[PDB]
């Protein structure tokens, strides 16, 4: 039998009620004797596609419905098999969200949407427009408080604003979404981000604000507002803030259009426990007690289960959540969604940090929102390995331990194949020599700013000063400005900018 056979392994994002779900798992373990293990790994959304297929990976995966279409398309999720008596217990529209090519590809759980969360003691009346925020912050600054603070590292949070005035993702054309019609480069979109960029220029927000930093700012009462979803209410209650939840601010007289997502559970197609996974989902989780339990840890939002939604239905927070949901649009689920998210995330972090003008970021964002991309076989907790698309820069390991820097000209066969070119003039071409490689012959050189440093002792491939070659090296320490101090093998110590210090594939063996 396969190693995964005989038990269940669940994956869920770290901001949901995985402890409340562990409870649902205990009731199940008890009734069947089978073991259930709940995990909340980092960047699970990117690891699932690389480990699920090797025939391994978790048995159940929880994420917003937007990424499920790509998994189903690639054959990583199995077609679920609920009868009609069960299909009736869920809201017909939540089933619509997890359908791909007329096939049900996952069990829906809840409808979640971002709302404006505010402090009542600090702000008895919240602004209705974004344009009131710049003045609201000047007023609040005199008392040592800020007006707004939310995650600027994840595009999902800024999207509501980028969409209010006309920005969209993919156009819903005939009976479908035209991937040839991206709307992240139109004036509607540019006007929203430009407004966001200005808020930062005028010191109303700092581009370093991430998720953790904002949550604390609001829970300690350092800021009057924040834009988050239902799952965040658990921590606020635990704190002191006397808060409220209402509609998002308008922009240019238009409502903020938050992308609406349906948390959903998928069943891995490689799994030998598809039938134990169904038992768990239909009889234990999607039950009044099963949801009530997960809802208790961290609020789920508007639940797909009709009978239990009758409870939260009257809750004002759910009311606001559904209000904003009705004003926004439901995320698509085509395979191009992950490429799309990588492009916008790249454009938002860049425009906000000055590294790129709004025009430049969004223009490129439109160029890579539909692009086919691949990922490197070598992964690292310190450096991203995707997405590798045309125009990307990488470290290539010639068949002929030196790695040369190359540009990517073509991604083919679903990202399992590339055609890279060395830009330095070669005997066969002054434009550069071209090679064909698979996923193990290269490492992605992240184009954006670095996020994590390498612990001292880490083996890496750094580009040597005045060369286009990456040589083996050992990390001594990281200089504050970010820069890595390194001892190069077979030669003072050498200082190389972090952007040129990649993980070692050899060490990763």
């Amino acid at each position: 039998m396969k190693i995964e056979e005989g038990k269940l392994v669940i994956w869920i994002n770290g901001d949901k009620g995985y402890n409340g779900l562990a409870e649902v798992g205990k009731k199940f373990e008890k009734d069947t004797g089978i073991k259930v293990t709940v995990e909340h790994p980092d960047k699970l959304e990117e690891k699932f596609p690389q480990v699920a297929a090797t025939g391994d990976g978790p048995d159940i995966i929880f994420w917003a419905h937007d990424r499920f279409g790509g998994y189903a398309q690639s054959g990583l999720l199995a077609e679920i098999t609920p009868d009609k008596a069960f299909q009736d217990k869920l809201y017909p529209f939540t089933w619509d969200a997890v359908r791909y090519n007329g096939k049900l590809i996952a069990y829906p759980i809840a409808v979640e949407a971002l709302s404006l969360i505010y402090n009542k003691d600090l702000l008895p009346n919240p602004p209705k427009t974004w344009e009131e925020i710049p003045a609201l912050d000047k007023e609040l600054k005199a008392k040592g408080k800020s007006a707004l603070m939310f995650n600027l590292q994840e595009p999902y949070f800024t999207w509501p604003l980028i969409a209010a005035d006309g920005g969209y993702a993919f156009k819903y054309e005939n009976g479908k979404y035209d991937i040839k019609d991206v709307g992240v480069d139109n004036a509607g979109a540019k006007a929203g981000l430009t407004f966001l960029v200005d808020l930062i220029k005028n010191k109303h927000m700092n581009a370093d604000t991430d998720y953790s930093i904002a949550e604390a700012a609001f829970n300690k009462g350092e800021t009057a507002m924040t834009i988050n979803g239902p799952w965040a209410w658990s921590n606020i209650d635990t704190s002191k803030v006397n808060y409220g939840v209402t509609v998002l601010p308008t922009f240019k007289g238009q409502p903020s259009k938050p992308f609406v997502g349906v948390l959903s559970a998928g069943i891995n197609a490689a799994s030998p426990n598809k039938e134990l996974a169904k038992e768990f989902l239909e009889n234990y989780l999607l039950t009044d007690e099963g949801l009530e339990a997960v809802n208790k840890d961290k609020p789920l939002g508007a639940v797909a289960l009709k009978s239990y939604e009758e409870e939260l239905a009257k809750d004002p927070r759910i009311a606001a959540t559904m209000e904003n949901a009705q004003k926004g649009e439901i995320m698509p689920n085509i395979p191009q969604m992950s490429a799309f998210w990588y492009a916008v995330r790249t454009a938002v972090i860049n425009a906000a940090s000055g590294r790129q003008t709004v025009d430049e970021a969004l223009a490129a964002a439109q160029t890579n929102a539909a692009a086919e991309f691949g990922s490197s076989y070598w992964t690292s907790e310190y450096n991203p390995n995707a997405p590798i698309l045309v125009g990307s820069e990488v470290a290539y390991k010639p068949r002929r331990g030196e790695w040369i820097q190359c540009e990517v000209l073509k991604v083919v066969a679903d990202g399992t194949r590339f055609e890279v070119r060395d830009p330095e003039p070669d005997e066969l071409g002054n434009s550069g020599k071209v090679y064909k490689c698979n996923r193990k012959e290269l490492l992605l050189i992240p184009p954006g700013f670095p996020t994590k440093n390498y612990p001292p002792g880490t083996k890496v491939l750094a580009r040597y000063p005045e060369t286009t070659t990456f040589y083996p090296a050992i990390v001594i320490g990281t200089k504050r400005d970010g820069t890595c101090r390194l001892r190069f093998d077979g030669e003072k110590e050498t200082e190389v900018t972090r952007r040129l210090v990649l993980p070692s594939p050899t060490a990763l063996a």
Binding site: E402, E466, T469, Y471
Partner: peptide
């Protein structure tokens, strides 16, 4: 590619 030494 450009090399060392």
């Amino acid at each position: 590619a450009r090399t060392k030494q």
